[PDB]
Design a protein around this ligand. Structure first.
Ligand SMILES: *[C@@H]1O[C@H](CO[C@@H]2O[C@@H](C)[C@@H](O)[C@@H](O)[C@@H]2O)[C@@H](O[C@@H]2O[C@H](CO)[C@@H](O[C@@H]3O[C@H](CO)[C@@H](O)[C@H](O)[C@@H]3O)[C@H](O)[C@H]2NC(C)=O)[C@H](O)[C@H]1NC(C)=O
Ligand SMILES: *[C@@H]1O[C@H](CO[C@@H]2O[C@@H](C)[C@@H](O)[C@@H](O)[C@@H]2O)[C@@H](O[C@@H]2O[C@H](CO)[C@@H](O[C@@H]3O[C@H](CO)[C@@H](O)[C@H](O)[C@@H]3O)[C@H](O)[C@H]2NC(C)=O)[C@H](O)[C@H]1NC(C)=O
Ligand code: A1IRR
Ligand code: A1IRR
Ligand SMILES: *[C@@H]1O[C@H](CO)[C@@H](O[C@@H]2O[C@H](CO)[C@@H](O)[C@H](O)[C@H]2NC(C)=O)[C@H](O)[C@H]1NC(C)=O
Ligand SMILES: *[C@@H]1O[C@H](CO[C@@H]2O[C@@H](C)[C@@H](O)[C@@H](O)[C@@H]2O)[C@@H](O)[C@H](O)[C@H]1NC(C)=O
Ligand SMILES: *[C@@H]1O[C@H](CO[C@@H]2O[C@@H](C)[C@@H](O)[C@@H](O)[C@@H]2O)[C@@H](O)[C@H](O)[C@H]1NC(C)=O
Ligand code: NAG
Ligand code: CL
Ligand code: CL
Ligand code: MG
Ligand code: MG
Ligand code: MG
Ligand code: ZN
Ligand code: ZN
Lengths: 604, 605
């Protein structure tokens, strides 16, 4: 490590620790930037050399974390928990957590290389027999094909192509990650991930939230299963069993908005999927980002800086260059460079994804002057929620009308139910998946789920929570969890379950602050500077204050609460119950063993 | 509650608590007796009227528990946790725990009736083809001796459907009432109360650490047996990389595999260690089996069975038509006189082991009958379940079988040792995953992790995860396959048996050392060792007067459960099965976890 990056000498007291933290954040800005820059060069251009460079930068980051973590323990390990400055206590506690820097040098290299190789496998995997990529090809098949056999070939092809080669690498990664964080005092890596929420009863609190939300998912599930039965028949749909996992519009069955046109109860009413209109009007990726930006500036939040427009990758490159297409937002920790990398497609759900990613950017811009250790969300779920809150207003029929994507809708009951159903397909359907992914990974990290049960336990959870089943037989050669981006790319997932609850709490708070008075699901905070001010306070706080205090300042409550979500969907929650009762539906999937048969003469 | 049974007055300090505790135990003995008597009358003669009498006896026990429990809390709830005498803290702590007596009268009656009706359903269920088969003996003998895939399937499916399906609504109601009761005692759910009997803050982690050490032995036995079954049933019904169909292992619950020993025995030219056929040839009856078990106990200078045991016990299924609970059990009537076994005894070697298991309970009762009633239990429940099994470890040795005339030829060679250890593994190692999983299931039900909508999903998740078996016909949540196992509807906790199967080898090692035996642990026979008897007697006479960790330390030199004695016992066959599976190219485990067998072509015609 460069001598200028190595830590100096400081007194072993709170005053010296304050100086220590300043010198830490000073040098960390330079180390973080070279790491983020090298990761960016790789993710927008996957090659062996860029992987080599990214691993060089990761090693330097670990050397830096080792030097500064060791110094923090030498000086402050006995005393930092009694410092009077709470923000200093948070900084010092972080620096003394070394993570992968606890590993010997050889295992650091092994750890860094596993990350590079898992990333390459996921983002370069293809389904052949010409070859299809996940984004756009298989994504478009899953969203729009209504051919059981075609959807199956895409689902099986993708899960086999991505998951199988990842499994031996993921086993090695898990072992090294655990070895690293055990030396920080964590029982396993998952315990470190959960520690970010600073809640002794986190897992119980989540379970209690899901208990309040599960009736909503069960009724949506049964309603959608009934529509699928009519399209595909009794041979492929079991009205008392799990839904085949390839039929819900999405490779992971995690959001169901793409089958809206199959389940929309009133197709005579205006089409609330404005994708057709976006294409008819000539929207491109740049228009989508500019429209998202203008929502932020309407709230008197910040526009995207020139560095964002000049450096971002907003479309998949056409030079054949291989990229990580999964959408992501990037902070280079130099207070200047901020970018999105998205293989943007012109659809309504992509417009929502654009808002999601620009929410991260807005966060980055609002806390860019905090010390680096505080340049985080109040917790990770806060970061994933910011853009989704704005998209809730954008999706309203009235707002779509304002931006020319919808000829004004009549404010009738068929239309309110159409809208809340479409929103349920996007938000309620996701809840079980947002909850289960890290339940799976927590069990892998803890050792409850050894490699010999990776797929058994994954499908246990997928059936338990989502009520889906694999449409072809799976065994432990398969690694279907690995076919989801966040697993090989080691991005935690419980943040998205937290986000999907939190965003309705934020929405209710901002709508009240904006002066809105009508139904919560018709609120649009567009151009509310008061609502922007209340959001800006959250964003500028970073992680300087406990998320429970930041939340109470914003919404009046210091905990996650499902009531705003329930109040948002109240009308369609009632409607769905009635429909399922009238159709005599069974809620849930008591024939839990059921799997569909194979199409005749598949794969031909 | 009869005036003579109601609590009087005592001082609200520790010295008064000693007098309270002394008087509580004095009256508790009479309430215990009438309850056990009424349960005996019902279980040996299932009738509507005997069930009513048992429910009225249970209500009286609840009235007693409430009156004395409320008196303990009135006088001591804020102070008994600071008492200087830890044995007093134990008892005041038990009396403050009212259990089902926390329920209001109407719910007490509901609870008692649920227990009675769940017991009746399980023990009177039949599989009909006019002509109907009972679990014991009819279906038990099919599972043990039929090798017809279709006949075994008829018995397995028939039993699980007949017992499980009607139980499910009752079991849901029982679970809710049980939780409501124990939550008023301060437990998060009933399972937390059940686990508290082991007084170990790390109990669940301790069990998982034991199971990690044992699982490789199970995986290798499983792969070896699965190969033997494949050679008999064929590639259609056995998947060499999948779970074993749950009806092919000799036992309705696949929990002991001793009955398929003839298909797995590696060296059949050696003496046949399954002596059932010799017991039948020689005319053994139930009474002989109990007398031979008794004589092992007396050879150790432990107590014979008293006349009251022989006159009162039910040692055979009654031939007078009447319905009984056939599951083997041992009974303390809490009057220091009456002790009985109720078993529908069949003349087999595994039943001889069951006889020893039940007589181990009786011996415990005889040794601690003069302790105060609250301390008349095992150091923990796993101790109680291990006593008879320890003796049966000696009885089953080829040398001991020769002594009692059940094995003419004796041989001491490596092939005979492998045969013996494989037979013992079919009984002891095959059980371990099942002994561990049953209460994982039930803990999840009590905690609410497993709602009624997932009773069977979670049961079979655990059956496959631990035992590596699959149901041979499709199941759904109308089925309640956990309910087709005695201990679930009869509300008998199960982790005690996992504990016991580990503990019994710790006990065996210590008693063999005390007896002066200096050969391989699996050839030890403590028969006629009065030194071993005296060491076991010290455990039995302690009851629950002392923490089990201290009792274990005195007996075996360690204050914790330890898998090493079991591993040492099985070491030779552990290594042999590993080598055999490697040479045969076996896959350890069941990576085709989704696999289920097809149905027979003419099922169930
Ligand atoms: C659409 O129309 C609704 C009213 O109609 C409602 O929705 C239809 C689709 C049908 O299902 C109808 O049966 C149903 O009633 C408008 O909602 C109403 O807005 C007014 C004005 O904002 C609300 O009155 C306010 O209410 C609060 C307390 O709730 C008071 O503090 C205020 O002083 C004020 O009176 C009214 O409550 C509200 N109704 C409901 C059920 O929430 C909605 O504004 C309109 N939206 C659009 C975009 O056209
Ligand atoms: C079955 O046979 C085993 C093995 O017998 C041993 O090996 C054979 C190949 C021959 O060489 C035999 O002569 C030889 O003993 C018996 O196990 C052995 O038992 C003896 C005592 O009977 C043990 O010797 C004692 O060991 C202790 C120390 O452990 C000393 O204090 C004693 O002085 C004495 O030497 C011997 O260790 C033990 N061997 C093993 C490997 O455990 C076994 O007893 C026999 N069983 C029956 C039922 O006949
Ligand atoms: C319209 C919309 C809104 C929100 C989402 C969220 C929720 C579900 C999850 C998923 O699609 O499964 N999801 C993303 O994935 C988005 N994208 C990231 O969350 C990036 S910010 C995560 C990341 C990636 C790489 C490095 C660092 C961070 C999807 C779609
Ligand atoms: C040879 C042998 C040895 C041990 C056993 C044990 C272990 C497995 C378990 C079972 O067979 O599943 N098993 C019993 O069941 C025996 N019998 C009871 O354990 C009675 S003492 C429990 C009880 C019943 C009713 C009221 C109170 C207590 C089986 C076979
Ligand atoms: C089984 O239980 C029944 C009661 O449910 C017993 O029948 C009673 O027998 C006693 C004598 O022992 C008579 O005084 C009662 O009038 C009988 N009652 C009824 C309702 O029949 C029966 O004897 C018991 N059988 C055995 C073998 O003990
Ligand atoms: C895992 O599965 C692979 C793919 O085939 C699937 O499983 C077999 C058993 C059939 O049911 C087939 O229809 C399925 O599509 C197999 O090639 C592979 O051998 C299996 N792995 C193991 C370890 O058995
Ligand atoms: C549960 O299953 C019962 C019968 O068993 C199953 O029957 C058919 C449908 C096949 O799946 C077969 O392999 C099974 O054994 C049904 O009678 C009952 O309706 C099912 N319960 C529910 C709620 O669907
Ligand atoms: C991609 O990276 C390689 C290094 O592997 C570099 O030579 C090349 O210029 C990069 N391509 C683009 C388009 O930036
Ligand atoms: Cl997270
Ligand atoms: Cl127990
Ligand atoms: Mg989508
Ligand atoms: Mg058996
Ligand atoms: Mg037998
Ligand atoms: Zn995000
Ligand atoms: Zn027992």
């Amino acid at each position: 490590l460069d001598p200028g990056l190595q830590p100096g000498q400081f007194s072993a007291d709170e005053a010296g620790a304050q100086l220590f933290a300043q010198s830490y954040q000073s040098s960390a800005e330079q180390v973080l930037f070279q790491s983020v820059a090298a990761s960016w060069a790789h993710d927008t251009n996957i090659t062996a050399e860029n992987a080599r460079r990214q691993e060089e930068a990761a090693l330097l980051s670990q050397e830096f974390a080792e030097a500064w973590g060791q110094k923090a323990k030498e000086l402050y390990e006995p005393i930092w928990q009694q410092f009077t400055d709470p923000q200093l206590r948070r900084i010092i506690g972080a620096v003394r957590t070394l993570g992968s820097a606890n590993l010997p040098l050889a295992k650091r290299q092994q750890y860094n290389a596993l990350l590079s190789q898992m990333s390459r496998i996921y983002s370069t995997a293809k389904v052949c027999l010409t070859c299809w990529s996940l984004d756009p090809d298989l994504t478009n098949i899953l969203a729009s094909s209504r051919s059981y056999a075609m959807l199956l070939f895409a689902w099986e092809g993708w899960h086999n192509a991505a998951g199988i080669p990842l499994k031996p690498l993921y086993e090695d990664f898990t072992a090294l990650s655990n070895e690293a964080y055990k030396q920080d005092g964590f029982t396993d890596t998952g315990a470190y991930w959960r520690s970010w929420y600073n809640s002794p009863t986190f897992e119980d609190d989540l379970e209690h939230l899901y208990q309040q939300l599960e009736p909503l998912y069960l009724n949506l599930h049964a309603f959608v299963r009934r529509a699928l039965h009519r399209r595909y028949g009794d041979r492929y749909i079991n009205l008392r069993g799990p839904i085949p996992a390839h039929l819900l519009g999405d490779m992971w069955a995690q959001s169901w908005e793409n089958i809206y046109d199959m389940v929309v109860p009133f197709p005579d009413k205006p089409n609330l999927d404005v994708t057709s209109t976006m294409l008819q009007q000539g929207w491109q990726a740049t228009h989508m980002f500019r429209v998202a930006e203008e929502f932020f500036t309407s709230l008197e939040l910040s526009p995207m800086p020139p560095e964002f427009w000049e450096g971002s990758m907003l479309e998949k490159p056409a030079d054949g260059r291989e990229v990580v297409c999964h959408a992501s937002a990037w902070d280079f920790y130099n207070r200047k460079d901020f970018r999105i990398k998205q293989c943007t497609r012109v659809t309504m759900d992509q417009l929502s994804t654009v808002h999601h990613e620009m929410g991260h950017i807005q966060y980055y811009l609002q806390y860019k002057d905090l010390p680096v250790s505080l340049r985080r969300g109040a917790n990770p779920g806060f970061h994933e929620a910011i853009g989704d809150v704005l998209a809730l207003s954008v999706s309203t029929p009235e707002h779509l009308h304002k931006i020319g994507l919808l000829d004004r809708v009549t404010n009738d009951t068929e239309s309110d139910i159409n809208y809340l159903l479409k929103m349920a397909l996007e938000k309620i359907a996701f809840l079980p998946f947002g909850y289960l992914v890290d339940q799976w990974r927590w069990g892998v990290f803890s050792g409850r789920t050894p490699p010999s049960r990776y797929n058994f336990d994954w499908w246990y959870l997928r059936t338990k929570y989502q009520g889906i089943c694999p449409p072809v037989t799976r065994n432990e050669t398969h690694f279907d969890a690995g076919a989801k981006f966040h697993v090989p790319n080691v991005t935690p997932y419980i943040r998205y379950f937290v986000s999907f609850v939190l965003q309705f709490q934020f929405h209710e708070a901002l709508c009240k602050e904006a002066g809105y008075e009508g139904p919560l699901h018709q609120c649009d905070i567009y151009r509310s500077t008061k609502a922007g001010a209340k959001l800006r306070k959250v964003l500028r706080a970073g992680s300087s204050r406990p998320w429970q205090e930041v939340l109470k300042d914003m919404v009046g409550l210091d905990a996650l609460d499902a009531q705003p979500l329930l109040k948002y969907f109240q009308l369609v929650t009632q409607w769905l119950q009635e429909q399922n009762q009238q159709n005599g539906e069974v809620l849930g999937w008591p024939e839990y063993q059921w799997h569909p048969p194979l199409p005749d003469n598949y794969p031909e």
